[PDB]
Amino acid sequence: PLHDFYCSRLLDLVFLLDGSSRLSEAEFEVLKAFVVDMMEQLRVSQKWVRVAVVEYHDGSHAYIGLKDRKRPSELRRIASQVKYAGSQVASTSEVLKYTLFQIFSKIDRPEASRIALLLMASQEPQRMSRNFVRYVQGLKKKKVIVIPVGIGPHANLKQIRLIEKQAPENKAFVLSSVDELEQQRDEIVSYLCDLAPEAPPP
Amino acid sequence: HPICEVSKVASHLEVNCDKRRLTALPPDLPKDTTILHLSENLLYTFSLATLMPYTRLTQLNLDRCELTKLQVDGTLPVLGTLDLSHNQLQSLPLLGQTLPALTVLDVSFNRLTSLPLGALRGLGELQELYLKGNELKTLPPGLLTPTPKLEKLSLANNRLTELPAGLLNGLENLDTLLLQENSLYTIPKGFFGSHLLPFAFLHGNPWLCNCEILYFRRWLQDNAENVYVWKQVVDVKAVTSNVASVQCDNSDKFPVYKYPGKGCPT
Ligand SMILES: C[As](C)(=O)[O-]
Ligand SMILES: [Ca+2]
Numbered sequence: 001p002l003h004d005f006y007c008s009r010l011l012d013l014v015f016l017l018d019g020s021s022r023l024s025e026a027e028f029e030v031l032k033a034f035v036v037d038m039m040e041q042l043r044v045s046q047k048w049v050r051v052a053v054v055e056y057h058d059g060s061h062a063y064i065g066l067k068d069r070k071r072p073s074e075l076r077r078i079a080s081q082v083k084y085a086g087s088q089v090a091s092t093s094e095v096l097k098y099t100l101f102q103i104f105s106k107i108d109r110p111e112a113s114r115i116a117l118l119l120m121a122s123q124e125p126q127r128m129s130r131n132f133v134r135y136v137q138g139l140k141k142k143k144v145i146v147i148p149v150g151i152g153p154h155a156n157l158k159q160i161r162l163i164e165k166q167a168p169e170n171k172a173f174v175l176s177s178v179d180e181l182e183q184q185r186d187e188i189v190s191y192l193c194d195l196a197p198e199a200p201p202p
Numbered sequence: 203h204p205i206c207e208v209s210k211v212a213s214h215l216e217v218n219c220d221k222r223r224l225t226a227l228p229p230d231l232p233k234d235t236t237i238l239h240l241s242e243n244l245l246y247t248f249s250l251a252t253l254m255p256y257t258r259l260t261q262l263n264l265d266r267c268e269l270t271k272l273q274v275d276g277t278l279p280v281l282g283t284l285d286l287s288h289n290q291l292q293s294l295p296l297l298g299q300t301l302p303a304l305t306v307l308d309v310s311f312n313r314l315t316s317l318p319l320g321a322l323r324g325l326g327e328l329q330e331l332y333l334k335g336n337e338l339k340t341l342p343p344g345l346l347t348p349t350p351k352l353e354k355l356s357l358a359n360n361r362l363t364e365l366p367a368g369l370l371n372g373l374e375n376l377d378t379l380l381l382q383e384n385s386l387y388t389i390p391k392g393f394f395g396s397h398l399l400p401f402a403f404l405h406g407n408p409w410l411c412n413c414e415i416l417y418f419r420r421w422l423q424d425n426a427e428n429v430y431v432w433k434q435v436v437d438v439k440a441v442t443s444n445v446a447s448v449q450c451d452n453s454d455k456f457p458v459y460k461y462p463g464k465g466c467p468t
Binding site for chain 2: 010047048058059060061062063065078094097098101102105106108109111112
């Protein structure tokens with residue numbers, strides 16, 4: 001497809017997909033299509049621009065890692081085929097914990113912007129949220145920018161605001177449904193473009 | 203270069219020599235090489251000293267090269283990452299005097315049957331050690347003594363029946379410990395110390411639930427949120443919190459952290 005604009009950046013981008021039942025299977029497909037769209041706009045190639053894709057419910061399910069050496073079209077295919085979980089619980093604390101310690105532990109590429117796109121449609125039980133702030137602060141020290149995208153009326157707004165207060169760069173986006181993903185995609189991608197260092201078009 | 207691809211990504215000069223049916227290092231590589239990929243070739247043997255002309259080499263990938271022996275001499279002063287995974291090494295090479303700046307070492311999925319005494323000596327900057335998928339039965343004492351900065355340790359899918367009591371001594375920065383799928387039956391008293399360990403994988407072991415497991419049971423009770431299950435189906439890797447994954451051998455999947463310990467001394 002022909003998107004409204006494209007940009008190549010020195011960027012490490014992690015997609016974190018809410019795998020709760022707050023999204024129907026059809027709505028989850030819209031979320032996945034949004035992820036593929038962003039990958040196309042950002043000209044993802046695992047060279048100058050690298051991506052990871054994680055679906056999270058009770059735990060993290062990693063479909064793509066930043067160092068996976070696969071051709072772009074395969075990356076996009078993998079992301080589009082991420083399996084719908086539809087679980088009762090999608091723990092934001094666990095997936096940020098996972099991101100902090102298992103994805104962004106070592107800064108091999110310090111010149112690159114590091115971004116965790118946290119796509120939220122649910123609200124974990126407060127029992128699991130004890131170390132939530134510690135993990136967001138942890139990512140801050142790792143120079144990882146956390147971008148929470150709230151989708152629907154069941155998004156954990158309290159945690160979204162908490163993410164914003166930890167660091168000025170942590171910009172939040174609040175959407176009424178998955179239908180607004182494509183409508184606000186340009187704004188989200190634009191923010192990434194103005195944020196990250198420029199890369200050569202491949 | 204006539205054989206390998208040369209690419210510039212940010213400040214890195216990446217040289218790609220992988221998947222080319224090579225049986226040896228191609229000569230006359232660019233002297234400013236910072237990353238060298240030799241993955242998926244037919245090397246079988248390799249010598250680190252042949253890379254000494256490349257004084258800016260920080261990453262070396264020798265994975266999937268059918269390596270049976272790795273000759274180690276000379277010095278690669280700024281090498282930070284070494285990938286020797288998916289080869290056929292039967293003995294761990296001593297890399298400390300040759301790779302003093304090494305921070306990541308991966309020798310996963312080889313044929314290691316043991317680790318020599320002082321195996322990691324000189325590797326003071328080491329932060330990650332992966333030895334998953336070998337044939338280790340026991341570990342030497344003070345294995346991680348010269349690596350106090352260690353953050354990740356993977357010993358998953360070996361044949362370990364015991365762990366040294368002082369294995370994690372001096373590791374104030376350990377955040378990930380993988381021990382799943384071994385033959386472990388007990389944890390020595392004081393093994394974990396007082397250090398907080400965010401990720402621990404302990405499932406897939408025949409834990410023997412008797413009076414000797416009580417130290418472990420207490421630790422599991424105090425660290426239930428830090429115990430995880432590792433699972434890879436097809437290409438999808440899953441990491442999920444589940445303290446009940448640590449189960450007693452010879453039972454109906456009974457979780458160690460609930461083991462009564464009836465009749466055990468107080
Ligand atoms: C032109 As479009 C809605 O596919 O980015
Ligand atoms: Ca599309």
